[PDB]
């Protein structure tokens, strides 16, 4: 059931109790965890925090901790499955679920005692009515009703997508409690920007949520500040920006930013040998010297920078890149620390999905979670360096795929596969980084190919995962049209193929459109996918 008021029916309940946070491995989950940690630390709520990277380790952690905790909070996990069946809880536990995944499972919706959904009722939700889903001529009509149930429930469960950011939900809770600090607002901004960077939401919804956050930014910017009374440089200042879509461009050279941003790399076709001359034509049209463009942005001459954003937009419009600007936010504090929300997103994401083998994925979660606090600015800057490396590896992998023509149109969907031992495959073995790679590669492919047919197809990408057990990670991506609503069917198409072929499919990641598959079964799995999508 949906929690109507977060303050009354969730926070004031768990405020008196020991609580267990299960937190998923993504930047929005991390930001929601930071906000909720801050509230609990204000109120001396003795919580325990456990990272979980998948369903099986969530089940393991719950089996470990179910004896000692009666109140659980799941951040960016649980809403899209039957948690009662998955975890098999005791009759009197409570699971609060703050999760962006949609559609919410009908058992989660209509469970009225144990599952409590911290989900805004005004999200994109169309739940079927209870009587349509739950309980001679009489039994004939019973069977007819069951057939109608199967039809309706397939129509409900078909398309998976994402709702409002969990960080924004927790910030609204903090605002209702009136314990909303400026760093909490920054964490909310970073969660929404994580959704936008990973393309989990439409541009319309992102602009609407930015419009929501602008008012909170104005309120915080007038708590103790106006045009004639101003604070120390120590204090944090969040500012609304109509900034550039380039990635990390204030922390490395504008050349590296243009080369390693997905949009401009795809448009200029910089994987190709000819694309560098297109980029040089763009820079010459702007009138920026190449030495300045290749110099680091902080060391670039200041006479080039104070109208650079509108210069970029003006040149991009006549080059056909009609939307180089983006509505975003920045944070300043001290004399020299300045970050865009995209910069913090990429740094934290890289700290999570780092290619380092030392430690473990939970240690990398811990590094990412530490980097979001300003007591660990060294960790944030290290994450920025790792993000530069990750972006470069992404472009090299895209270039390899397109140059070798690994992307082949398998009728209903394009298909690509990474190969074991090839460069950076270990970096992209992790499902989140693989999803980002597949999205960037699909944009690059759509800009590359001249066929009108290929510009509309979705894409399925495979990569090696295991040799001790011999498996691969497979992801499904929707088409990259500007008309797209950012919903995909691959979460259900994969399991329909898997059950049609009786394939050894394992379903550990929280997104249904990412799976693990035995390397032998991929042939018949793909055959079933072509047969299914038709």
């Amino acid at each position: 059931m949906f929690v109507s008021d977060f303050r009354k029916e969730f926070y004031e309940v768990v405020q008196s109790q020991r609580v267990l946070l299960f937190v998923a491995s993504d930047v929005d989950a991390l930001c929601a965890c930071k906000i909720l940690q801050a509230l609990f630390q204000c109120d001396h709520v003795q919580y325990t925090l456990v990272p979980v990277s998948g369903w099986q380790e969530l089940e393991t952690a719950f089996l470990e901790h179910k004896e000692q905790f009666h109140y659980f909070i799941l951040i960016n996990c649980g809403a899209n499955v039957d948690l009662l069946d998955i975890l098999q809880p005791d009759e009197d536990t409570i699971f609060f679920v703050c999760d962006t995944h949609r559609p919410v499972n009908v058992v989660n919706v209509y469970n009225d005692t144990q599952i409590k959904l911290l989900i805004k009722q005004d999200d994109d939700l169309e739940v079927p009515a209870y009587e349509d889903i739950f309980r001679t001529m009489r039994r004939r009509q019973r069977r007819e009703w069951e057939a109608r149930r199967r039809d309706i429930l397939f129509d409900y469960e078909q398309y998976e997508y994402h709702g409002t950011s969990s960080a924004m939900v927790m910030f609204e809770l903090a605002w209702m409690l009136s314990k909303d600090l400026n760093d909490m607002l920054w964490w909310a901004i970073v969660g929404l920007t994580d959704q936008w960077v990973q393309d989990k939401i439409t541009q319309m919804k992102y602009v609407t949520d930015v419009g929501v956050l602008q008012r909170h930014v104005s309120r915080h910017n007038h708590r103790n500040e106006d045009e004639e009374n101003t604070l120390s440089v120590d204090c944090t200042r969040i500012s609304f920006e109509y900034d550039l879509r380039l990635v990390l461009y204030q922390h490395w050279s504008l050349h590296d930013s243009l080369c390693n941003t997905s949009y401009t790399a795809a448009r200029f076709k910089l994987w190709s040998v000819h694309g560098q001359k297109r980029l040089q034509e763009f820079l010459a049209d702007m009138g920026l010297p190449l030495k300045q463009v290749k110099q680091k942005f902080q060391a670039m001459d200041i006479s080039l920078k104070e109208n650079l954003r509108e210069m970029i937009e003006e040149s991009a419009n006549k080059f056909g890149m009609k939307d180089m600007r983006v509505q975003t936010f920045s944070i300043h504090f001290g004399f020299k620390h300045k970050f865009l929300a995209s910069d913090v997103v990429f740094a934290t994401m890289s700290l999570m999905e780092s290619p380092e083998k030392d430690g473990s994925g939970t240690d990398h979660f811990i590094q990412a979670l530490d980097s979001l606090s300003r007591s660990n600015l060294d960790k944030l800057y290290h994450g920025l360096e790792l993000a530069k490396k990750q972006l470069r590896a992404t472009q090299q992998t895209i270039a390899s795929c397109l140059c070798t023509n690994l992307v082949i149109s398998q009728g209903p969907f394009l298909y690509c596969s990474l190969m074991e031992g090839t460069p950076d495959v270990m970096l992209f073995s992790r499902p989140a980084s693989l999803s980002l790679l597949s999205k960037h590669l699909l944009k690059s492919f759509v800009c590359s190919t001249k066929n009108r047919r290929c510009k509309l197809l979705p894409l399925v990408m495979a990569a090696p995962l295991s040799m001790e057990h011999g498996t691969v990670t497979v992801v499904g991506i929707p088409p990259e049209t500007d008309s797209s609503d950012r919903k995909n069917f691959f979460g259900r198409a994969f399991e329909k193929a898997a059950e049609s072929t009786s394939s050894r499919m394992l379903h550990n990641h929280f997104d249904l459109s990412v799976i693990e598959l035995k390397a032998e079964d991929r042939s018949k799995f793909l055959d079933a996918l072509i047969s299914l999508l038709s």
Binding site: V273, S400, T404, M419, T422
Partner: protein
């Protein structure tokens, strides 16, 4: 040859050209040579490029293109090198050292 192993091993490609008698090849070679002397007066099957086009092609291929090796089926080349070393030790015809492996990578590129 009268050269020694350190200099012999530094040459990736090592060619022997012989001038043995073979009448049909001699006739074809003679016709080609006399035809060349006719063609260049002051006035295989596949056809070549013009040399201007070849020069432009060469400089483009050298400066604007950079091959990158993803895989090369390591077992094949490793076994080849191992028994090439065996036969070189057997006959003494040519030292093989380790440079021939890297010559394989260079020639592929």
């Amino acid at each position: 040859v009268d050269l020694t192993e350190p200099i012999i091993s530094r040459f990736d490609i090592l060619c022997v050209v012989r001038d043995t008698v073979d009448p049909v090849q001699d006739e074809m070679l003679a016709r080609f040579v006399v035809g060349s002397h006719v063609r260049h007066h002051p006035s295989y099957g596949v056809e070549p490029l013009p040399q201007e086009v070849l020069k432009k092609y060469i400089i483009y291929a050298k400066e604007r293109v950079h091959p990158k090796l993803n895989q090369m089926d390591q077992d094949k080349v490793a076994k080849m090198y191992s028994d090439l070393r065996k036969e070189s030790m057997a006959t003494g015809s040519i030292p093989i050292t380790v440079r021939h492996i890297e010559s394989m990578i260079r020639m592929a590129e």
